Design a protein around this ligand. Structure first.
Ligand SMILES: CCC(=C(c1ccc(O)cc1)c1ccc(O)cc1)c1cccc(Nc2cccc3ccccc23)c1
Ligand SMILES: CCC(=C(c1ccc(O)cc1)c1ccc(O)cc1)c1cccc(Nc2cccc3ccccc23)c1
Lengths: 9, 227, 225, 9
């Protein structure tokens, strides 16, 4: 999930 | 978040404002249906990244679990893009300012015309109401927190506490503008009723977005969020 | 124009009086539960039309404008009515007094558990907020006037909406809510409408995918297309 | 449209 990852970084 | 005053809310919101991105629009090419919609997907795809980091700067959003943040954005991403579009287009009557280099009207529009008119009507509404930037950043934050809250044991009460403060914040702005106690109520209602139509436009748009399933990797992970 | 001249109490007493009645319905299958629902909805539609005509300010509008508003918000109104009926039945949706269904009985038909849960979620929120009937009839009238207003006069419609806002605030001040408690409650109520709008769109979406359906329902459905 | 009939009856 890109959104989940992008919320991390 | 819950400790922030009204002025610290507005300032934090205004400081969190994403930039306005440009389009890869070449004016020497009469747009088609695939061309113009390609520019819009590419623009929205780049806008999403800024919205995601804008969300983290929205009071109370970081306090939520990683699970709930994803949910709130998947439901409201198009609403936030649309109200942002409407906000940019406020001083351009009959036109929708998708980007500083991309300014379209109903005639050129749908190079699809139904949703164009709705966005124009919404923009005319903000113009008629003389919407302020401090009011806009409040509404946009509300959309992020309200659109996916009734779609979730567990902590939803905190989200309402934030929403209530943004309500106070909205009231404080109208009060600091010299509006009467009745005027503050009516305007507050007028603003939040717009969100109902913003929701409508987002739904009809999302409905058209998986009708043609022009597709990036981040959009598709949110186009299935409504399927 | 009558509506504008009314006071907040005369507005509540007008809306409470124009209230449609609660109609009745005729293990289920897919076409069974749907069939009963379309039959119930079609009969409710006739009462809604007469309820709309008794909403202060709705008759001041042209016949064309009346059609537009009703075509736009008919399902929203049916839905908020369903949510209001199911408020005292937690975990259940009271379509009719003789038609009470919950989450597991819900499905059969394709999706319709997602929207079922949204209605239930919409049914728990009023309960938590302790939504009054006086408030409910105000929210429903707003939906009738608001949902199609930016899809068209100057109006008027905004002037009536403002009066309904003033009326909602009066009820909250009549209940001993502080000045801050009024704004907040007002906001919380009007945000539900965004979700009712959403539920209507997802339900309308499913309706255009299919049940014989009545000619009246077809006209209300061919408006969202 | 039926809706017209019911809005005038
Ligand atoms: C409202 C425009 C729009 C956007 C969009 C969003 C995601 C995507 O993959 C492609 C476009 C958009 C772009 C930038 C923003 O800042 C805000 C929104 C959108 C979304 C869904 C459907 C449609 N439908 C349309 C099709 C063809 C022509 C249109 C002309 C005007 C408005 C909508 C059109 C657009
Ligand atoms: C929420 C129910 C609903 C209604 C409906 C409207 C029009 C129509 O042709 C059929 C049903 C309805 C009926 C009476 C009311 O007083 C209020 C609303 C509706 C609308 C769209 C889709 C669905 N699908 C379903 C949703 C939730 C549960 C379901 C269970 C069985 C079958 C369908 C369901 C319902």
């Amino acid at each position: 999930k890109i959104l989940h990852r992008l919320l991390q970084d | 978040a819950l400790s922030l005053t009204a002025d610290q809310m507005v300032s934090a919101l205004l400081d969190a404002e994403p930039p306005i991105l440009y389009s890869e629009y070449d004016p020497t090419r009469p747009f088609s249906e695939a061309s113009m919609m390609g520019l819009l997907t590419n623009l929205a795809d780049r806008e999403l990244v800024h919205m995601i980091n804008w969300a983290k700067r929205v009071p109370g959003f970081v306090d939520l679990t990683l699970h709930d943040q994803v949910h709130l954005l998947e439901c409201a991403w198009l609403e936030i893009l649309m109200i942002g579009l409407v906000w940019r287009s406020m001083e351009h009557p009959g036109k929708l300012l998708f980007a500083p280099n991309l300014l379209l009207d109903r005639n050129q529009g749908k190079c699809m015309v139904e949703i164009f008119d709705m966005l124009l009507a919404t923009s005319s509404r903000f113009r008629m109401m003389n919407l302020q930037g401090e009011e806009f950043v409040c509404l946009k934050s509300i959309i992020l927190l309200n659109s996916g809250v009734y779609t979730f044991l567990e902590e939803k009460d905190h989200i309402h506490r934030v929403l209530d403060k943004i309500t106070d914040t909205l009231i404080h702005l109208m009060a600091k503008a010299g509006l009467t106690l009745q005027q503050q109520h009516q305007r507050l209602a007028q603003l939040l009723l717009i969100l109902s139509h913003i929701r409508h436009m987002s739904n009809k748009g999302m409905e058209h977005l998986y009708s043609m399933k022009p597709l990036s990797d981040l959009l598709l992970e949110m186009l299935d969020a409504h399927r």
